[PDB]
Design a protein around this ligand. Structure first.
Ligand SMILES: Nc1nc2c(ncn2[C@@H]2O[C@H](COP(=O)(O)OP(=O)(O)O)[C@@H](O)[C@H]2O)c(=O)[nH]1
Ligand SMILES: [Mg+2]
Ligand SMILES: [Zn+2]
Lengths: 40, 203
């Protein structure tokens, strides 16, 4: 009931989603660890 | 705002039906992304669970698997995998350990589902007794037919349960799937389901 993702799920602080391949990357990375696309 | 999502790598020999399979999910096909640096199509597949939506971002090759291993970037940050073979081609089943080795080498103990595709075809060569005889611990197996949507949701539900750590997780509705191109014969499905159950329980 209260285990719904909207209530309990959150992403790491500063995390960014690669616009090219959707991999989730560290705030400290300038480029995607998988496909090398640069952070926006 | 944030949405639960996982990178899923779909691997297995060329011609086993990987691309046909991922494409059954209609919205994943219309929203797919082409990754030029790696020659990959990433299909964002949403499934609606009793706890909300989850997205499997499925990595489908552009055929390079025919010419040796895939590059590391294909595997990097994978959170789960499907290994596919073709139940009409014993060679594709014999290569399963090789894909499994490559996966663990880069991704260690991520959850993996093994899928035997094309079970709609009557002249089946890799049968349940052989698949169960070679069953690997933690390597969950399903019969699938991409072309008929047969068992489409099962690999994803099993992985979701493992990733979330919730054995009671359910899909509340099926995704919108491309209409079946071939009929999965009901008598054949019932036989294969029986053969699997027998192999899994027989002493
Ligand atoms: N009868 C049957 N044919 C399939 C199925 N899935 C794929 N095929 C065919 O197998 C061939 C290779 O399919 P493809 O998706 O390109 O395989 P991939 O190389 O692993 O991506 C194609 O002719 C498909 O039409 C299935 O479930 N049943
Ligand atoms: Mg393909
Ligand atoms: Zn990327």
């Amino acid at each position: 009931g209260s285990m719904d993702f909207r209530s309990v799920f959150s992403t790491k602080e500063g995390q960014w989603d690669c616009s090219a391949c959707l991999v989730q990357n560290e705030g400290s990375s300038t480029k995607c660890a998988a496909c090398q696309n640069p952070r926006k | 705002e944030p949405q639960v999502q996982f990178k899923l790598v779909l691997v297995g020999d060329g011609g086993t039906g990987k691309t046909t399979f991922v494409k059954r999910h209609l919205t994943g096909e219309s929203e797919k992304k082409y990754v030029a640096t790696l020659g990959v199509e990433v299909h964002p597949l949403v499934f609606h669970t009793n706890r909300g939506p989850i997205k499997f971002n499925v990595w489908d090759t552009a055929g390079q698997e025919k010419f040796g291993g895939l590059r590391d970037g294909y595997y990097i940050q994978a959170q789960c995998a499907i290994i596919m073979f073709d139940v009409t081609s014993r060679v594709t089943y014999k290569n399963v350990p090789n894909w499994h080795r490559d996966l663990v080498r880069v991704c260690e103990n991520i959850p993996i589902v093994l899928c035997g595709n094309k079970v709609d075809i009557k002249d089946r060569k890799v049968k349940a007794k052989s698949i169960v005889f070679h069953r690997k611990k933690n390597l969950q197996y399903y019969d699938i037919s991409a072309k008929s949507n047969y068992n489409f949701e099962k690999p994803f539900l099993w992985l979701a349960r493992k990733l979330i750590g919730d054995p009671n997780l359910e899909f509340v509705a099926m995704p919108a799937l491309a209409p079946p191109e071939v009929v999965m014969d009901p008598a054949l499905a019932a036989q294969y389901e029986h053969d699997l159950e027998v192999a899994q329980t027989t002493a």
